[PDB]
């Protein structure tokens, strides 16, 4: 898994690859690793896929209830505090490694959370097996006062480094841009540079090829 | 990690490196290991980042609730709360914390809390993996009632050596000055401290 977060002058952008694997086998060729905690707070997850999904949805649910109770748009630090207290309670047994990013009344924020409940702050972060490939690109090209279009390019380039060089990462690039005073735009399959080439042959079987012992109509109705 | 707190004439100064490592990979090269538990009570975190963050967060909560009821807590009180958490949960914590604070009565004070959960009040304290390499240097060079500029140099030269020899330590040297004047944050970059 390759997930990055990049800060720009008026917001934050997060990107991720689209490959899910069990051991060396690719289970999902196009999987969504970008999750919505709240409308303007988005999360990218690496580690145990089930754990990142579950912890994201739980805090997302509690953040919605908190937002309704306080009659206020939720803050990134609230999502961060609730996540890291929950992850710390389970002493790393919940294998969720998250890049949390968003905009709130306070401004734009970018954090990373580790399974044991440690948090980091940065202008550029990368998590997952392809983090070292991604961080190499970020360390080479990142600068202060990035524009929106520059931050998307840098983020997608860092993910691509993972896709090509890391076996754990592959397929497409998902991006989410959270800009201040604007709706967050989720760019599902922003890049698709790994399209399957036309097969040499159609393996459509002549009808009757398979030998059949019994047929029966199944009753789905009442 | 390389962290230290030094008492001087006008108060106390906290120093730390900025390097967080998982194995031989630097996860964060600009870590802030100097954290606020109260306006003029700060701490230096070494050991598990997860554990030291969780402890620091709880203490900040306890001292905020203390302040609501009984006004400003002493540096000794802050160190006692740190000790209580560290000692009672010694079996589940990997945390070496240096507590440093400025009262107006007591002036600058430094308490070190090693793995055990013991408390030690010292004129200056050094901790983290990098500290081993600068026991000799720090002992020979530390003086009581130094000036601000002397204490900044003492910390800068000390952590400079710690960073040079310890692979686990590196990046920038962060410092936090605690005096009657207030709270001052200082940063020093490799290009300066490396060639000391």
């Amino acid at each position: 898994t390759t997930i990055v977060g990049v800060k720009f002058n008026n917001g934050v952008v997060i990107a991720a690859d689209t490959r899910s694997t069990q051991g060396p086998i690719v289970a999902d060729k196009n999987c969504a690793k970008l999750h919505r905690i709240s409308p303007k707070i988005w999360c990218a997850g690496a580690g145990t896929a089930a754990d990142t999904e579950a912890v994201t949805q739980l805090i997302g649910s509690n953040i919605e209830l908190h937002s309704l109770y306080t009659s206020r748009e939720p803050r990134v630090v609230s999502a961060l505090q609730m996540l890291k207290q929950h992850l710390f309670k389970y002493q790393g047994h919940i294998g969720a490694y998250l890049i949390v990013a968003g905009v709130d009344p306070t401004g734009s924020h970018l954090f990373s959370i580790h399974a044991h409940g440690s948090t980091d702050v940065g202008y550029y972060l990368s998590l997952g097996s392809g983090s070292l490939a991604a961080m190499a690109v970020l360390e080479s090209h990142w600068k202060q006062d990035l524009t929106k279009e520059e931050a998307i390019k840098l983020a997608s380039d860092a993910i691509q480094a993972g896709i090509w060089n890391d076996l754990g990462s592959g397929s497409n690039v998902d991006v989410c841009v959270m800009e201040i005073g604007k709706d967050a735009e989720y760019l599902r399959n922003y890049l698709t540079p790994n399209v399957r080439e036309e097969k040499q042959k159609s393996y459509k079987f002549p009808r009757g090829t398979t030998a059949v012992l019994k047929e029966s109509i199944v009753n789905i109705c009442d | 990690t390389s962290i230290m707190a030094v008492t001087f004439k006008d108060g106390v100064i906290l120093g730390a490196d900025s390097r967080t490592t998982t194995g031989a990979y630097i996860a964060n090269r600009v870590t802030d290991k100097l954290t606020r538990v109260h306006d003029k009570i700060w701490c230096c975190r070494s050991g598990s980042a997860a554990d030291t963050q969780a402890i620091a967060d709880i203490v900040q909560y306890h001292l905020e609730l203390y302040t609501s009821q009984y006004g400003t807590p002493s540096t000794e009180t802050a160190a006692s709360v740190f000790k209580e958490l560290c000692y009672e949960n010694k079996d589940n914590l990997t945390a070496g914390i240096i507590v440093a604070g400025y009262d107006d009565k007591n002036k600058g004070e430094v308490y070190t809390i090693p793995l055990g959960g013991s408390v030690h009040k010292l004129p200056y304290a050094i901790a983290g993996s990098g500290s081993t390499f600068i026991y000799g240097y720090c002992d020979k060079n530390f003086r009581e009632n130094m000036s601000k500029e002397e204490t900044v140099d003492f910390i800068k030269h000390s952590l400079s050596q710690a960073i040079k020899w310890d692979g686990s330590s590196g990046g920038v040297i962060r410092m936090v000055v605690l005096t009657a004047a207030g709270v001052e944050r200082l940063i020093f970059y490799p290009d300066e401290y490396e060639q000391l």
Partner: peptide
């Protein structure tokens, strides 16, 4: 697991 990060260290300091």
């Amino acid at each position: 697991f990060l260290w300091x």
